[PDB]
C-alpha cells in the first residue's frame, strides 16, 4: 500500500504547482467567499487596514447653585 | 412435501462440513496465470490446519480498482479500493 501511498504524494505536488490559483473553483468559489466575508464584515465593523483611531471626550460641566444659609 | 429440495440442499452442506472447509472468494479481476493460483492454494492449505482439502471459487468484479478481497470461512481480510477511502485522514484529520 506504499506504492499506492506515493501515488497520492505525487498528486499533492502537482496541486502545489499553481499559477492561476483555483482551477476547479471558477466564479463559484470567487463569488461566494467575497460575498461571505462582506456579509460578515458588515456584522464585524467598518475599520480600515492601517488607520489608527484617536479621539477625545467631553466631561460634564460641574456647575453650582446657591443656597442662603447664615 | 413442497420443501423437499430445502431439506436435501441443507443436508449436503451439513454433510460437507464433515470433510469440507467453507470455501473462499477471491474477487479482483480477469483470471491470471497458473503460478499465482497455485501459490494461494498452497498458503491457504497452511491456514486451515485441519487435514481437509480446501475448495475455492473465483469471481470477477472490476469495481475494485487494483486489489483483492479474500475470505476464509468467516475471516475476510481486505486489500482493495478501501485504501482510497482511508484518505479521509487528509480531511477529517
Curated annotation (Swiss-Prot), chain A:
- Localization per record: Mitochondrion; Mitochondrion inner membrane
Kindly list the GO CC terms recorded for this protein. Answer: mitochondrial inner membrane; proton-transporting ATP synthase complex
Keywords, in A-Z order: Acetylation, CF(0), Hydrogen ion transport, Ion transport, Membrane, Mitochondrion, Mitochondrion inner membrane, Phosphoprotein, Transport
What name is this protein filed under? Answer: ATP synthase peripheral stalk subunit F6, mitochondrial
**Organismal lineage:** Eukaryota, Metazoa, Chordata, Craniata, Vertebrata
Q: Give the source's domain of life in one word.
A: Eukaryota
Any idea what job this protein has?
Subunit F6, of the mitochondrial membrane ATP synthase complex (F(1)F(0) ATP synthase or Complex V) that produces ATP from ADP in the presence of a proton gradient across the membrane which is generated by electron transport complexes of the respiratory chain. ATP synthase complex consist of a soluble F(1) head domain - the catalytic core - and a membrane F(1) domain - the membrane proton channel. These two domains are linked by a central stalk rotating inside the F(1) region and a stationary peripheral stalk.
Q: Which GO terms describe its biological process?
A: proton motive force-driven ATP synthesis
Annotated signal sequence is: none
Family, according to the entry, reads as follows: Belongs to the eukaryotic ATPase subunit F6 family.
Assembly, in brief, is: Component of the ATP synthase complex composed at least of ATP5F1A/subunit alpha, ATP5F1B/subunit beta, ATP5MC1/subunit c (homooctomer), MT-ATP6/subunit a, MT-ATP8/subunit 8, ATP5ME/subunit e, ATP5MF/subunit f, ATP5MG/subunit g, ATP5MK/subunit k, ATP5MJ/subunit j, ATP5F1C/subunit gamma, ATP5F1D/subunit delta, ATP5F1E/subunit epsilon, ATP5PF/subunit F6, ATP5PB/subunit b, ATP5PD/subunit d, ATP5PO/subunit OSCP.
From Swiss-Prot, chain B:
Which locations, inside or outside the cell, does it occupy? Mitochondrion; Mitochondrion inner membrane
N6-acetyllysine is found on: 41, 45, 55, 59, 75
- Which residues, renumbered to this chain, carry the PTM N6-succinyllysine? 41, 45, 82
In what way is this protein post-translationally modified? Acetylation at Lys-45 decreases ATP production. Deacetylated by SIRT3. In response to mitochondrial stress, the precursor protein is ubiquitinated by the SIFI complex in the cytoplasm before mitochondrial import, leading to its degradation. Within the SIFI complex, UBR4 initiates ubiquitin chain that are further elongated or branched by KCMF1.
Q: What does this protein do?
A: Subunit OSCP, of the mitochondrial membrane ATP synthase complex (F(1)F(0) ATP synthase or Complex V) that produces ATP from ADP in the presence of a proton gradient across the membrane which is generated by electron transport complexes of the respiratory chain. ATP synthase complex consist of a soluble F(1) head domain - the catalytic core - and a membrane F(1) domain - the membrane proton channel. These two domains are linked by a central stalk rotating inside the F(1) region and a stationary peripheral stalk.
Q: Which family does it belong to?
A: Belongs to the ATPase delta chain family.
Q: Quaternary state and partners of this protein?
A: Component of the ATP synthase complex composed at least of ATP5F1A/subunit alpha, ATP5F1B/subunit beta, ATP5MC1/subunit c (homooctomer), MT-ATP6/subunit a, MT-ATP8/subunit 8, ATP5ME/subunit e, ATP5MF/subunit f, ATP5MG/subunit g, ATP5MK/subunit k, ATP5MJ/subunit j, ATP5F1C/subunit gamma, ATP5F1D/subunit delta, ATP5F1E/subunit epsilon, ATP5PF/subunit F6, ATP5PB/subunit b, ATP5PD/subunit d, ATP5PO/subunit OSCP.
Q: What is this protein called?
A: ATP synthase peripheral stalk subunit OSCP, mitochondrial
Q: Which residues of the full protein are shown?
A: 118 to 210 of 213
Amino acid at each position: 500500500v506504499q506504492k499506492l501511498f506515493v501515488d497520492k504524494i505525487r498528486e499533492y505536488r502537482t496541486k502545489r504547482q499553481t499559477s492561476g490559483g483555483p482551477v476547479d473553483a471558477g466564479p463559484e468559489y470567487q463569488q461566494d467567499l467575497d460575498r461571505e466575508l462582506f456579509k460578515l464584515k458588515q456584522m464585524y465593523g467598518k475599520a480600515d487596514m492601517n488607520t489608527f483611531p484617536n479621539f477625545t471626550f467631553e466631561d460634564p460641566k460641574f456647575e453650582a447653585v446657591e443656597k442662603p444659609q447664615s | 412435501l413442497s420443501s423437499t429440495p430445502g431439506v436435501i440442499s441443507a443436508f449436503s452442506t451439513m454433510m460437507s462440513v464433515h470433510r469440507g472447509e467453507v470455501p473462499c472468494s477471491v474477487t479482483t479481476a480477469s483470471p491470471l496465470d497458473e503460478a499465482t493460483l497455485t501459490e494461494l492454494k498452497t498458503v491457504l492449505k497452511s491456514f486451515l490446519s485441519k487435514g481437509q482439502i480446501l475448495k475455492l471459487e473465483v469471481k470477477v468484479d472490476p469495481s475494485i480498482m487494483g486489489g483483492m478481497i479474500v475470505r476464509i470461512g468467516e475471516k475476510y481480510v481486505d486489500m482493495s479500493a478501501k485504501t482510497k477511502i482511508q484518505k479521509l485522514s487528509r480531511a477529517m484529520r
